[model samples]
Structures are given as structure tokens and as C-alpha cells.
Target: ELNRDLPTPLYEQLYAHIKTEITEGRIGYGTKLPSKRKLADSLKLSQNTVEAAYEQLVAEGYVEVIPRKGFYVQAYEDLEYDTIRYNFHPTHIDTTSFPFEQWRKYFKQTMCKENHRLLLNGDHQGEASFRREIAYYLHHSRGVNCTPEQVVVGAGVETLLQQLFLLLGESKVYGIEDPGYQLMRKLLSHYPNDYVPFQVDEEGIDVDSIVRTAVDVVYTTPSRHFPYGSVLSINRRKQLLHWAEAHENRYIIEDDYDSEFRYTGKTIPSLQSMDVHNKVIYLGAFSKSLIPSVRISYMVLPAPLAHLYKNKFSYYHSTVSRIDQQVLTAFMKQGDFEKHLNRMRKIYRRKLEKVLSLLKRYEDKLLIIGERSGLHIVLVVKNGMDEQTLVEKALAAKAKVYPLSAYSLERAIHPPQIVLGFGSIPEDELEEAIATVLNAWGF
Candidate 1:
């Protein structure tokens, strides 16, 4: 029976009824269905409705019809479904905070006749106007002063890094932190260049290690080191810049991934800001500040390198589409981007404080680090348990926790620590999730 007064169409309702019967095995395989006229008359529906429903079923393989025969139920396999109970992913952002309607407004506004030429291929480096806006934003927010020509927009950091490697040429050796972002190391390993792993300390990467290795290209997160979350001290920052200046070829690739959410002390200046010699290649993305799925990241090259990229890589085209770049440009130009940032900073600040307070019960058993900034914090478990065991226990308790050692290039011997991200988790559910983790750890 179908309700004609309901919002759902009559044919759809009839289709659902027949599908339910076939899937439930009430209408067995090889069972013939009634004629369209017969079913329409019996159900008090139009013959066209019955025919449409039967045609849909036949197209979907739920039923079949012969030249002169009616529809017949067809046997098919059932599907299995699964879902993760708890999510503690460190890199997740609060998607609920995204201004979908505002973005849609800008997106629609960008589709007008004046901007229709954006449908054509854009500049290889990126759209000129878009890069100008990014340059202005970075200059005001992060103290990075650069012209639009110095900026190159790409789909993601990985692609930008690849372009960097090509522009840098194959002559120089690279040095990356020991316990650092693993994906970059993995990507570099496939390249022809040689990269050495350097250890990091409380002050950031050990300068002595860089001096010893004589690596020309060094990659470091000066504002906030990943997994460890130690900001590069002023003294060390100067030393790094000095090292780069000492050798004309030496350059520091500063990955300022998440320096926007600093909660304590003064705002840390970017390495690029401190560089008077144009030695720091600044890289950042909208993933941490906004959302990750957007896949828009940028790299700010030194003026000399930027010029080289323009001439040498003139044949290359931008990886990002013209439409997406225009949408982002409009979003930032309208001040919605900054407005969104302020709102997110407040939301994340509260969430961070709440999570820290909730974990107070297990303070004696664990040490919390990296809480000063970013969406994630590291829990150094004092109890003697391997990292794998700690992760497995958390999984068993329906709480997901990431291992810090997973990012290390070489095996690191330290107390078991896990990364817990609270960006996506609601404040009301955060305490319950931490409680489950504590229960799993037997604290």
C-alpha cells in the first residue's frame, strides 16, 4: 500500500515495496510479478506508475522481464557494513564549523560573466590575484613579507615539495629531523638526493647535528615541531639562520604547519620572517587552519629561487583548478577566512582546556605534552608498556590513539606516548572518551 498524500512519489513507494519483498525472500527467485495493469488496478494506482516501478527494478537487477512475460524476482548478494566506533584522529578539523552557506554564496558570486574567463587555464605558478591575496594575508598574520611572484600555489604540500626538489636541482644533500613527518621522508627517499636523519631536542633540531652532517638543505618546523611539539628557541633560530647565511647554498625549509593556534607566551615568529638573506623557503596550508579536504597548500620561495622557477618551470601548469582557486580567493577577500579562523581558535581553545582538565585524573600515570598549541597533544605514559600495546588497548576500549614513534625515521627509545586530537570530538563527549582510554590503561 502507498500513501499518495505523502511527499514520496507513488512509483518510488511501489518500487520500495517490491524491493522489500524481493530482498526479504517473501517473493522468491523466479517468482513472476503481476502485470502492470493488474497491479495498478489492485493497488488503485496509475498503470504508468506500476510500469515505472517495474522498469526501475529491472534496471537495478532486482527483477527481469521477458518480451511477453511480467517481471520476475532475481537472486542477488546482500551487503555487509562496518563503522569505527570512536575517532581520535589528530589531524581532523571541526567540519561543523565550516560556513557552507557563506562559501556557496561566494562560489555563486564567482560564476558571473566578469569572472567567466577564469574557466580557461590559469598561470603556472597560480592565479596572479589569488597569490597576491595570500601574500597580503601571510604578511599581516605570520610576518612573512613576499610579493605575489614569490608564491606558488599547489594542490598539496607533497606536490609543492616535489616541485621544490626539481627546482633545487640534484646537487645538494638534505637533512630532516629524526622524529618528524614520515611522509616527506618517504617521498624524499624515492628522489635521487641523499638525506640524513638529525635528532631533535627541547630547543628544536640540534644545530650541532646540522653542522656535523654538512647538509645544504635542512627541513624543520621552527614554530612547532611535530609529535614532540617543541618550538625552536630564539637562540637556536638565530643559529640556524646564521648557518644558512654562512654558506650561500644552504637553505632552511620551514614547515609552519600549525602556528596559528598559540595559547601561551608571545606569538612565535616564522623562520622566514627572521631571514634577511632569503634562505628560508616557507610552506603552509589551509588544512590545519581551515579544513584538510580542500587540498590547497602554498610554498613561498626566495626571490632568486622564485625567478628561477618562473623561467625554468614555465612549461609546467598549476595543479589546482581555476574555479577552486577563485573560490578560495573570494572567500579570503570577503574577510570570511579570518572571521572563520577567530571562531575556530576559540572553539579549539575551549576543547583543549576541557580535554586537559578531564585527563587530570590520570596525571600521575601519564605526562601531557604539546598542549600549548595545535589540535593534538602527546601523552607520555609513565607505566611500562610498549607503544603497540598502549595503542591496542585504546583500540579495544573503542578509543583511537596514535603512536608518536610512528613518525620517527629511526627507532626512538622513550616512554610510551600517544597523540590525541580533540578538534573533531565534541566537548560533551571528550570526557567520556578520555575516561574510556584511562580504563583501558588501567589507571
Candidate 2:
């Protein structure tokens, strides 16, 4: 039954009720529903309201309408998904910290009558205004030297990387950091490119190890290593640039993932800044900084490759919508994005501190690693439990924890460890979730 007292619209409520009934198999497929006029009369609602609901149902493929006959329910059987309580997803961020009002304002503001041209198709690399804002922001924040033309915007890193695969050709050998991001590993393998794994230490993937490989390009999250959370050292940074310079066509894919929440020393200049040789393909995303659902990410390519991307990938259209680009452009132009970033940085820092403080009591059995920055931290449990055991026990505790080895390509040896993310968990419940997971592991 639709509740008149609820804030939801009557037509929407009616549509949802029928959708649920059809999906749950209560309204059997091929069963004709009452006419819109009759249904509205019985419910004491206007025929327009009933028509709205029935039209929506038909549009969604939940119901079919014959020219003069009643609507019939369609076959919409589907599996129910799990309802998770304790989510420890490393990629999750605190939604509470997002400046929703500002984003909403920008979105509505960009939708002005004068801006209707945004409804048209945008540049293949994304809107020029959006890329200009990115170029300005990156130069100010990360010292990345690039023109707006060099910045190619996409829906996410994978979107741009797929474009890279086509531009770089199918025969290029790739080098990736072990115990690093798994998506890159999966992408390279699926692209069927030959990829070699290099070991990562506290300073991130060493240059000497990469020197021995036949890799044409190396992908590393230099700003802050994924999962491990270590910044690639300056010594290794220069060594890598030299490595790229020593050989022709050797490139460095510097994915500065999770560098936004750095709570340590001065903000390090991006690898792109130091690339006088024009060999660094710097990558970034708004997923960590802003909301992930926006699906806006970008890559700053070298001059030559940028030209290559233009000519070679001409068939591919921009993956990100022009509306999102316009909204983000206004947000950045008005300085709201930077303000939001500043606010989130402090909020995440406090959460990180709270987690560190709570776990200090168990330092005896749990050796902490990768606490410097990012949303999640890794802890080495010196107890008898292996990485698999810790994760399994966490499930029993009604908490989810990730095993670091899952990110490794070759099952590289490391002590039993688990990653705990405090990003999605609220500040008040941080202690509660930590205790729940840690106690289950016999802390």
C-alpha cells in the first residue's frame, strides 16, 4: 500500500510496489494488470498517477502494455544480493565528508538554459574546460607540468589504460609492482600483454630490479603504494626516470593513487614534474578525492604519446559524460574542489590516527605496517594464524578483512597480515569494528 504521509511521490511508490510484486513472483508473468483508470478509481487516485506508474513499469520492462488492453507483468526473476553489515573494503571512503551541497549546486548551476550545448557531444578527450581545471589544479597541488591539452579525461583509470593498450600496441612487455593493485594485473593479463612482476619494498618497487627486465613500460603507484601505503623514494624516482631515458620508448606509468590523504611530510612532487625526458604517463582519479560514483579520472601523457593517442584512438569517444565534466569544471573553477579536498584530508587523518591509537595496545602480537597514509592499513599478526586464517576468522567475527597476498601476482612470501579500512566505518564505530575484527583474530 502507498503511504500518503511519506515524502515519496505517489506514482513512484505505486511503481515500486508493482515492481517488487513482479520481481518477487507474486504477480505472475503474463498476468494482465488492471486498467489504469480502474486501478486509480479503486485506489482513489487520479488516472494520471496510475498512468505514470504503469508507464514507468512498462519503460523498465517490468510490465508490457497492449494498445487497448491492460498491462501484463514480464518475467523479471533475479537473485537477491547480500546485505553486508561490517564492510572493510579498502577502496571505500567516508561519504559523510563529501560536500554534497556544493556538488549539487554546481550540477544545477551547470544545467542553466544557456549551457544546453553541454547536452551535445564533447571532445574525445573530455571537455576542454574540465581538462584545463585539472591542469591548473595538478600544477598547484602536485607540481605536474602539463598543458590542458596533455590531460586526457576518462571515466576511470581502466578507461584510459585500455586506450593506452591500443596506442602502445599489443607486443609491449609491461612491468608491474608485486603486492600492488590487482586490477592492473588483471588488465594486463586480459590484454594478453607480457607483464613481469617486480618486488616492492618500503621505498616502493626498486629501479635495479626493473633494470633487469625486458619491460617496455612499468606501472607503479609511486605517490603511495596501494595496500602497502609506502611512497616511492626520491632516489628510486630519479633512477626510474634515468631508466626511462636510457632506452627509447621506455615509459613510467605513475599511478598517484591515494596520495590525496597523505598525513606525513611535505607533499611530494609528482613523477611527471621531474620528467624532463617526457617519459612519465601520470595518472589520477577523483574516486579517492571526490565521490567514486562520478566516475571521473584522467591521465597526463607525454607530448609524443598524447599525439599518438589523438591519431591512433580516434575511433573511441569520451567515456565520461559531458554533464559530469561541466559540473566538475564549475566546482574546480569556483575552488570548491580544493576546499572539499582540504576538508577530507583532515577528516581522514583523524580517522587514521584513531585506528593507529586503538591498535597500539596489540603491538606485541600485531606488527603494524603501511599506516602513513591512505584509507587502509596492514598489520602483521605474529601469531600462529596465516593470512588466510585471519581473514576467515574475521568473517566469523561478522567483520570483513582483506589478505595482502590477494594483491600479489606470484604469492610472494610475507608474514601473515590483514588490511583494515576505517574509511567507510564511522568515527564512533571505528573502535567497535576494530575490536570485532581484532578479537576474532585472537588479539
Candidate 3:
């Protein structure tokens, strides 16, 4: 069936009509459909149009096309949808806290630029001007020592990590924090048995285990370890660096992710700042500090690696857009980025304080870990319940609280702990969400 006056093409219209019939169960599974020629003749359309519609349906798994037989509808099922009210997801940021108006102004200014290069494909290592701005910002703010040439910007951390893997070469065993960010471990799976998961200690990642494993490359969130929020102590930081320096090809990947949102004292200077042998590959992102949707992340490579990257991957183009890079550059250069950061810091600090106050009532039943820092805090349950049970109970209470063990590579050894992210939740609902969790855990 087709509407001749409608703007949609004949094939799209037919595809939509058939998809609807299949989804609504009007067409039973395994039921044969009319041949393309037969449908084309009936609909007064060409065979190509009917073929296109059938191809679309088959490609989307709505129907199966046998060698000589007509297409048959595939089994379909409908799922009920529910909205999540209180999400304690660690990666979420309060959208309301962002300076959308200021950003709009920057975006408008960027688009109004007379420079025609904005429309062109950007540099393989991002825009040079934008990289310069980032270099200046990192130097003054995080004490990261590097030139703009060393900075390689990408669409996201995953993109940067993927590039890093290629630059680091093959057959190299990498060490990642045991209960660390899950994506890094999962990404290494592409290399087939080339990664070693090392446990963390009170100070930070277990450097001893990493050293023992003989992994050439080690990845860590030295400034703020995720979920657990353990900042590597100055001693451990030095030890880790020394370990990297001792080996000929050993290097440390310092992920200073979420360092700007610290609620406590001044942020610890990045391990990259203390690096003498240029063994630390520094990773930073605007996603956590600014906004997640911006999709801008960078890696400050060591001089040797930078040279290696340029030599080997010069043909590879940057994943980030030139327009986005220009807009972010102007945002930072004009001081709007710093202003936004200050405002967000205050907002998150107040939220963290509010959560800590509510958590005081449950202090006897919960041992708080990694408070007074980062966007999230961890709570080790004193009750005899396991991590899954705690998360399940929280979900049953109409609130979602994540378990720390979810990040653990070795869940058998991990303890029962909950990670509460206060960044995205509204101030009014923070207490209610905490109360729900408390009641769910029978605290």
C-alpha cells in the first residue's frame, strides 16, 4: 500500500508498511510473502522498487529470503519499557549544570568564522591551534609538560585508546588495574591473551603485581581511580614511575580522567609532571570535565612515542571534527571553560556534602571509601549481603545503585560495595535515593 502524494519514496513506504505488519503480528512467522515481481505488478511499480523494499526488510531481520521461495516474516516480540528515575551511574553528568548559553555563543562565533578550513577535514592529529590551546591549559592546570605536537585529539577515550594500541605495537603484555575501568580490559581482548589484570591497594594500583607480571605497558588512573576513587599516594606514584623507568620498553599510561571535579584539597599534580624518563603517556578528556557529548579526548605522548606515532600513523586522520575543535578552542581561550569548571566544582561539592550528610545516619552499617573527591563515592557494606544481592535489592527498591565489583576483573575476590554517583541526581532527590538504598539493604 502506498500514498502517491506523500513525500516518502515508494520503497520506504512499502518497507515501513511491511515492518509494521510484521511487528504487529498480522503476518505470522515463516509465512511466505508475495514475490517481488508479483508485488511490483500489483503495486504498479518497477521490480527494483519492490526489490529494494524486500532487501530492507530482510537486512533488518524482519523477513528471511530463501533461494527460490518468497520472503517470510521473522518471529517478533514486543518488550515493555520502564523509565529509570534515580540512576547512580558513575558516568552521568548534570546536564543542567552545563553553561549551554555560553556554549551557544562560542558555537555561533565558531560558525561565523571567515576561515574556510573549518569545512575541510582536520589534521591527522587534530587542529594545531586547538592542540596548542589544550597544551597551554594542561600546563597551567594539571602541570602536564608537553608541546602541542605531542597532543593527539580523538572523538573519545576509546578512539584514543585504539590508536594507542597501534602505536604501542603487538605482542606486548599490558597491565591494567584489577578493579579498574572495564572498557580498557575489554578492549585488550582484541589482542588475544596480551593483558594482565593487577589488583589495587590502599595507595593505588598494585605496582608490585604489575612488576611481577613483567607487563611492558601499565595503565592506571593515578589522579582518581574510578568507582573506588583512590588517588595514588605520592610514594606509590614515584614507585610506579621508577618501575616504568627501570625497564627498557616499559611505560605507564596515566588516565587523569575526572581530575577536575575534585571536591577536596587541590588536585595532586599529575604523574606525567613528575615523569623524568618520559615514560608516562597522559590521557585527558573534556567529556568528564566539561560535557560528555563533546566527544573530545586527548593523549599526551612521550617524545619518543610521539615521534613513533607520527612516523608510523601519519596517514591516519583525526577522528574529531575541525568545527568541534575550533569551538572548544575558543571556549578555553576566552576563559568560559575555566568559569564553567569552577561553577561545576561548586555544584558537585555541595551535592557530595549533601550525600555525605545523609550517609552519616548509615555510617554504622556502611564504611565509606574515597569520599571528599571525584564525582562518585564508594560504600563497603557491613551487612552480610553480597554485591549482586545489594545491587538487586537496590533495583527492586525503584532506585539503581552500582556495585564496585562490577568493575572488578576478578569478582570472586572483590567485596560487597556500592558506588553512588551524586553528579547527575538532583539535589532534592539525593536524600530520597539514599533512603531508598538504605531501606533496600535493610540498613
Candidate 4:
């Protein structure tokens, strides 16, 4: 029985009813169904409505129709599955603070019928408007000097990294930060390049490791070193650029992740901005600064690599949708991107400060690190607790903290430190969350 007063159409309601009957075996296999005309007459529905319902049933494989006969039920089975997990993750951001009204305006603007040209194939690199705005933004904000020609936009860092590795081709030894981003190392496991871990200390990636390891490419999260939070010093930055300049084939992949959320000091100039020899491939993304699943990340390739990609790989379709690119271009062009970023920086700063004060009470038993930037901070336990026990105790208290070892590529040996993200936690509840976890650990 379909309800005409309901928001759902009668055809859809009929389709759902028949689908349930077929899947539940109430309608047995090979059973003949009434003709469209008869069904419409009996149900007092339009013939088109009855046909639409039957068409959906046939399309979904719940029923079929013979050339001379009516609709027939098909034998099928409905399967199901279940899974469970928790989201006490460090990589998550404070999505509640997103500027939905502004984003919705741009999204709708580009989605309107007048702007339907985006439905066609866009620039293979990305929409020109978006790349231009990105180029402008990076130049003024991050000191990244490059024209739109040098920018290559993609869905996410992972997708862009894949293209980058492919552009450089196989057989090159890559250097990664040790006790660094394990996810990047994991991403590399699928590639042909041989990657070695460079020990990271207070100054960031060990520059000497590249010389000793013969790595042609070096990947470093200089701005905020993923789970380990130290900025790459200027002196080491120069040495890294020099390392790449010395060899014609040597290059550096600067994963400038979470550089925007810095709560102290002057804005650090990007390594690419400091590069005079075009040895740096600068990577940036909106995952941390904006919506994570927004999937808008870009790379500023040097002239040689930019030209190389255009020649070899321009044939492939862009991974990002044209509509999304247009929407973001309008958003940035109208100056909302930076506006939202400034607001978020302030919000995150407040949250981090609250988290800092709450955890400050436990300074005797806990040492806090990486509070200068990004969404999450690390707490090194001095109470003689191992990483496993620290994490288990938090779970027992109905709280979750990420074990620092989760991001280590070399399984670093140190006092137990766990990552706690206050990005998604409400400011008022942050104290309670930390206190609960601390109490659980007998702090």
C-alpha cells in the first residue's frame, strides 16, 4: 500500500514493497507478476508509475520480465555484515568550526545551471582558476614562489604522491624522517622505491643520513613533523637544499602538512621558497586547515618536473572533480579561504591552550611536547608506564589516546608517550577528558 500524501513517490514505495517481498522470499522465484496495465488498474495507480516500479525491480535483479509474459521474481539473497571501532585519533580536526554557510554559498554557486560548463572536461592539471588562486595564496602566505603552471592539483596527498613517484619513476632510494609519519612510510610500501628512515631529533630529519644512505629523494614533514613535533631548522633546510643541488637527479619532497596551525613565532618560509636550484617539490593540503575529506591537495613541482609531468602523464584524467575545483576556486577567489583559516587558527589556539593548562597540572608525571603547532599534542609519561599500558589505561577510563609508536617507522625506543587530539573535543569537556585519562593512569 503506497501513501500518496507521503513525500516519497508512489512508484518508489511500490518498488520498495516489491523488493522487500522478493528479498525476503515472500514472493517465490519464477512467480509471474501482474502486467503493468492490470497492476495499475488494481492499485488505481498510473500505468507509468507501475512500470517505473517494475523497471526498478528488474534493474536491481529482484525481478525480471519475459518477452511475452509479465514480471517474474528472481532468486536472490540479502547479505549483511557488521563492524565496530572508536575515533580517538590524532589526525582528526575540529570539523564543528567549519564555515558551512560560506562553503555552501560557493558550492551552490558553482552547482547552479548557469555554471554547468564545469560538467565538461576541465584542465588536466586542475581548473585554471583554482590553480591560479592556489598559486597566489601560497606566494603571499607561505612564501612559495611559483606561477599557476607549476601547480598540479589532485584529490589528496596520497594521490599526488603516487603521481610524483611515478613522475620520478622507479629505482630511486628515498629518505624519510625516522620516528616520523608511519602512514607515508606505509604508503611507500606499495611503491617500487626503496625508502630508508633518517633519525629525527630536536632539529628534525638528520641531514647526514641522506649522505650516508645514498637516498636520491628525501621526504620530510618540516613544518610539523607528523607525530613527532619539531620544525626543520633553517640551517638544516639550507643543507637539505644543498644536498639536492649537488646532484642533478637528487630531489626533496617537503610534505608541508599542518604548517598553518602554528601558535608561535614568525611564519616559517617554505623550503621551496628558499630553494634557488629548483630542487624542492613543495606539497600542501587543506585536510588540516579545512575539511579533511574535502580532498584538495596540491604540489608545486619545479620547472623540470612540471614539464616532465605535462609531457608524460598529462594524458590521464584529473583525480579531482571539476565541480569541486570550481567551488573552491570561487571560495578562495572571493577571499573566504583565508578568512576561514584565520578563524580556525584562533579556535584551535584556544583549544590547545585549554588542553595545555589542563595537562600542566600533571607536569611532574607527564612531559608535553609539540604544543607549538597543529591539532594534537604528545605527552611523555615519566611515571614508568609503557606505551601499551598507557593506552590500555586510557581505554579503561572510556578515553582514548594514540600511542606515539603508531607513527614510528623504526619502532623508536623511548619513555611512553601518547598522542592526544583536542581538536574534536569540546573546550568545556577537555579538562574532564584529560583528567579521566590521567586518573586512569594513576597520575
Candidate 5:
């Protein structure tokens, strides 16, 4: 009877009802359940449905279904739940090392301050304090040439993506990176949009492939590629801009996600820096750099687009909380933000080093991809082993590894690969985890 209006299947609903009764002790130990045929007749359901529910109960150890005999209830017991919580996965992050002291200080200072100017809803564009400080930081840090007025803040990347797509008009084809940010593609699916998805390579996304497609807007992450850690090459960067220039109607959406943490050579220059013709709409965020809950992201709009948005979107564009803005503004203005970035750069760099060393032990067997610049890395294995089998093997050995196919739309025709995230995992456990994976997956 349950889940009548819900999306869950009827058999699943039946299973939940029976399991709840058993877990709650209503069905005591050694209690015999009805036969699948009798249960189906009693519940007005199919015999196979009742059989499947009973089979699941048996599989979950909640019941014992004997052949040519009725099912009996098992003992009620408190199942062990893992008290430990992980950010993304069990082995991804060490939650204890977060900066609690400084974050508390800033949170209290911003919320309890008596200044009415900041307490009140000030600017919709963003808190002027944060905006000005961000403008300064962007100019110096990312080589982004932008005035504060040109930058518009939003709650997060998806929010800004929606706003940008709307403001840009739904008329043009949006060219996306192949094996791209899959979630973004899912989000944009609701719109009546056309796109050209291009493949990625050693340097970065194929600029030539994107140019071949007749898309007007090129969506790219030149700084740090998602899923993959490719930093767009210097030559490819020039090629991207040149292609955009040759086609007057075309432009680029430069999603600068995590350019702050560079563990390798010098930081790659922003695509916006080379936008002499004003063909790039640079997007930046504080989510990956700071905390995701900070919810502060911005779009460095093209000169003309910025002016147009300021006029039309002035009333309804304020989604980020004013308190959050000033707090972040104060944090950036007082150099705390810069200090945090420097510290994170060091922290993530150390973690990457540990990961790289662990990977080197198995380097003879696996080929690692991408520039060593971001939080995640990819390890490619031989072609004989499929990604799913590798994942099953890794999981069976208690080592978590995300298969590369999770990022790609189609099954990868090349060798098997896995994405290993180092940001959340403890540096101490990095070696142990990688060793476990290497051992389980034949190194």
C-alpha cells in the first residue's frame, strides 16, 4: 500500500514494509512468513513480486527462506553504522584538519558586528568590500584584468551557469569539452540547447576539434580540467583564442574552477588575460578554492555583456547572502584569504607529492596522465583490464577508485583508467590506500 504515489516500484515498497516490521521487532525471531504464492494472493500481487521481496530479505540477512519450507524471521539486532562521515568518500578527506579557529573568528565578527551599513542589504552585485578585494586578488593572482563592476557574484557555479546562459540568449550552440564536466551537461539538458562536445588529449581539450564544430560559445576549463588534471598548453591557449577571433560571432566561457592550487610549474595564464578582442567570458569561483558552503562565485563578463546585465538583472540577481559577502570580503581584504590560499597550496601540494610517490612505486605498470597541478589525478592501466572489473577488484579489496568511464559519456575504447582524488584523503593514509589499489588491480 505504501509508495502508491511515489516513484519507487511496488515490490520495493513491499520489501520496505516487511523489513521495517522485522527491524522494529514486530516480527519476532523464528516467526514463519507466508509462502510466496500465499503472500501474493493475500496482498493482491504477482507471485514473482512476493518471491523477489522474500529473496531480497534473505539476501539482506533479515530472513531465512528454506527450500520447500516457509521463510522465518531472523533475530532483531542493532546494525553497526559507521559513525565516521566522509566528505565525498570514506577515504577521501580528513575532516579534522579544517581551519576551525580562524573560520570561527571571521564568522562571529561578520554576524555580530553592529555596523548597520554592512548589516543591511547593500549591493546586489556583491558586497563592495568583498568585490573590491576580489578584483584586486583576481588581477594579481590569476592575471585577470577586471574592474569590480564587471564581476557579478552568484551562489555557486550552477547558479552562475544558468544566469550566464540565459543572459547570453538561447540562440547559439554551446561547444563543450568531451569527457567534460558531465554534471554541467546534465544541468543544461533542460534547455532547448545545441552543443558540440569535443574530446580531450595530453595537453588539454582539442582546440582543433572545437574549431571544426560550428559552435559560437566554447565552454572550457583551461586552468584545471575537471575529472582530468590537464592544464591547457601555451600553444593550445593561443589556438583557442585565435579560433575565437577568426569567427567574429564566437566566444569562450572560461570556467576557472581550481587554478589557485598549482603543484607543478608556473601557473597557466587565464584565457581572459589574452582576450584583447573581448571574446572570453571568464568564470571564477571560491567553492573549490575555499569551502563549497561559502557559495560565492563570479562571472567576469565581457565588457558589453557586463553593461547589459547591470541594467536588466539589477533587481533579481541577489542570491548570495550579504553577511556571507562582507565576511568573505573582510577575509579577502585583510589578507586572510591570500594566506589561506598559500596554506592550501602547500597542503594540497604535500598531498599530491605523497600521491605521486605512491603512484611511482607502480609506475612500471600504470601510466599516469595530466599536469601535476590539481587535487585529482588519473592512472591508466593496460587495455586488457576493463574499468568496471578494475573497480570491482579495488572495492573488494576496500580501496576506493573511480573509474574513468564515470566521466566519459561513451565507454572508453583506450586502456583502463581510474581517477584518484587526494584532496579529502589524509596524507598519512595516501600511501596505504594507493598501495592497496595497486596490489588489488595488479599494479
Candidate 6:
């Protein structure tokens, strides 16, 4: 029965009571009702009042009555509604963790003080000051050995990669990790190039098989592999370098995407660093350490091949304002960049702790992946449901997350799981966020 105290219409109340019976089969097909006048007399209501209610039901197709006869429950039809679900897939980043003030100061300084000569289309070999500073910084921090002349600036890593393929001439084939960076794979495939997905294990890609299969470019994240965070082992790195040395005209694109945020000790040197034989083409970007919109990624090329790329693409290459370059140079030279790195490391580590702590509460249901590194983690569901189904269930429970299988390259060898980023969500919201995911997954 509808509550008498409820602020509802008598017609609606009567309709609900009759509708529930009709839906539950209490009122069977062809069940007849009393005449409006008879029902009005029995219920102590006016004939007009009963007629109005019955008329409303008839309009809704829930009931019908002949001219002389009374009302009868009609057959129920399937219901439908118009709706469009909203979809949002957010890339994560800790907004407050970065040292924006320090960066801005340097950015402003660079804009204010620039030589007019430095403002011209820069040597396709990047801004001299940035190249020099970055080269020096890499040598001391990551053991990379390269002169400033070898470095060329680009908007970002992907842009540089597109240029690299253009310069390398059209090739039908390339091989990158199966569950590697999706955007990078998408960009590579867009060139009408046949791209193969090479499987990677704990030690990173199997270099032997890659060499066996002839491909134009081999893309890898050696420092900390994508999705599954496996640092290519020491022997594997050396062996891969050896293979590159043997294969002439072949290129290895090393994307050091987020090596700056390494939680563990000793940032490993890039494959480009050990390139005495001049085969590895290193791609580095400040997108991770700096704001993402700051399109400031650069490439370090081999000495001999550097001239060809510059000569071919020289017209398109221009440095950011000399003031900007000088300020960046000054920031690197005066140790502001390093200081910011340390500050972010501490902040992220703390946020990571909070994220892990919340996830630990659901330890039985989830297997938190990768250790003490990167901005995100994979949470393997124990129920053995497929990744897509898991995502559906999570969404049903009102939790937002990305399934691990979504990142797979043509079916990777991983079980059902989801990837969650702790970097973007604040510490205060972490517990609730994790709980939402856990509850959605039926933990």
C-alpha cells in the first residue's frame, strides 16, 4: 500500500497498487474489475473520481473498458527508455606533486633574456643550450654519453618517431612489445606499415626472436617496461646492443618515458648511451617530470646519421625562444631541475603509500602489481572473470577503471585484471576510490 503520509496523488497511488498486481501476475489476463459507479459506491468515492482514475489507466494501455462494461487488466508489454551512457577514460597525474613555481621561474627567466641569433630556426640539432645542459645532466645522472650536437629537439617523442620513420624510408614491417604503449603502436600502424607485436616476459622482449624476424624498427622501454614493469636485465641489454651492432641500417628506438620517476636505486643508462657503434636512436621527453602539454621531447642521434636528419628536416626545426632555452639551461645548470625531481619523488612516494595501504585492505581480492615504481599498478582480480566483464561489473558498481586486457597487444599472456592510477587521485579520496573498485568487483 502507498503511504498515506507521502505527498503523492490519489490517482498515482491507485495506479501503483494496480500496476504491482498486474506485474506480479496477481491480476491475471482477462481479469475484469467492478464498474466505475459500483466501485465508487463501494469505496465511498464519487463516480467521476473512479472514472478519472480508470480513464488514466486506459490511456496508459494498462486497462480497457467497453461502453457498457467495466475495466479489465490488459497484457503487459516490454518497457523501454532513451539513454546514452557517458564514457570517460582519464590519464593520471598528481597535480600538486610537481614543483610548478620553480619551473615557472625558470620559464619566465628564459623568456626574458634571449639573444636574437638564438631565436632563428635552430640547428636541426636542437637548442644548443638545452642540448648541452641535458647531455651533461644525463651523463652524471644516467651514464648517457653524448655531445650536444647529437641531440635534436621535437614537440614530443611520437613526433620525433614519425620523422625517424620518414627519414629511414618506407618499410612494410616493424616489431614492438605486444602490450606496449597503445598510442605509439597506433601511430606506427598509421603509416600503412605492417607492425608485429613481440611478446615480452619478466626480463623484457626476447631479442633473439626479434632479430630472427626482420623488422625496420624495434621500440622498447628498457629502463622500466610499460604496463608490466620489468627492467630489461643487464645481460639482455648487453645482448640487444650486440644484436644492434651486428645488424647494419636497423634502428632501436629507446623511449625513456618515465625513467626520471624511478623509485628504486640507480637509473639505468639508455641503449643510446652505449651506442659507440651508432645504432640506437634514443627518445627522451620531459612530459613526465614537467607538465604533459609542454611538448619538449628531444632525440639523440648517432654522429654520422645526425647530419642527414638535420639536412633533410632543417627547414622545419626551430628552437623555442632563446629566453626559454637560456632559462631551461640555467635551471639545469644551477641544479633547480634535480631539486624538483627529489621533491616530486618524495611526494609521489607518499601518495603511493596511501594508495597501497587502501588496496591492502582488499588483499584477498586483488593482486597489486609491480613493485615500488611508476605512477600506476595492475590489480589482478581473483574471481577469474575476463577483463571486459570485470570492467562491466566494476562500472555497474559505480567504480571507474581500465581493464588490463585493454592494454594487451593482440592477446597478451596475462590473466583478467585492471590498471589503476594512484597519481591523479588525492590521498584523502584514495580509500573511498579503492573501496568503490573492490565493492564493484564483488570483493
Model 3 CA lDDT for position 240: 79
Query: Global lDDT for candidate 2?
Result: 0.78
RMSD of 1: 10.6
Ranking by lDDT: 1, 2, 3, 4, 5, 6
Per-residue lDDT for 43-141 in model 5, tens only?
Answer: 789888788877887898888877898988876677577222212231233345567688778888877647566555657887666777888888997
TM-score between candidate 1 and the true structure: 0.78
Per-model root-mean-square deviation over C-alphas: 10.6, 10.5, 10.1, 7.6, 16.5, 18.0
Instruction: List the global CA lDDT of all models.
Output: 0.80, 0.78, 0.78, 0.76, 0.74, 0.72
Give stretches of model 5 more than 4 Å off: 1-95, 116-122, 439-443
The list of candidate 2 runs beyond 4 A from truth reads 1-83, 410-415
Give lDDT: candidate 5, residue 38.
77
Clashing pairs in 6: 110-323, 110-324
Per-prediction TM-score: 0.78, 0.79, 0.78, 0.79, 0.74, 0.73
Candidate 1: tens digits of C-alpha lDDT, residues 56-133: 878988878988878766765464552345687778899888888998888888788886666789587787889899
lDDT of 6 by residue, 1-443 (tens): 44667788666677787787787777777788987767778877666667788888889898888787767777664545512122223245567867768877766665544544645554555556778888888778878877888887777766777887788777546778757578767786567676777787776889888768777677888887777778888788888887777767677878876787776675766666666777887777776775666667777887778888867886684534455556767877888778778887888888877777766776776687676777777667778667777777767866656665657646543467666666566667776766666667657
Candidate 6 Cα outliers beyond 4 Å, as residue runs: 1-91, 112-124, 319-324, 396-398, 412-415
lDDT of 2 by residue, 1-443 (tens): 44588888887788777767777778776887878777778889898888877887778787789898887776757657633568877888778877677778877887888876668885787777877888888899898888899888888888788878877788888888776677767887677687877787776787898887668998888777777777777888888888889999788888888766667676877778888878888888888767867788888887888787788877878878877777778878978777777888898889888878887887787777775767888777788757887777777767767777766656554567667777788889888777677678676
Residue 122 in model 3: shift from native, Å?
3.3
Q: After superposition, which runs of candidate 4 have C-alpha atoms over 4 Å from their true positions?
A: 1-87, 409-414
Q: Put down candidate 3 lDDT per residue, 133-170, tens digits, no spaces.
A: 99999999889888889988888989888877876678
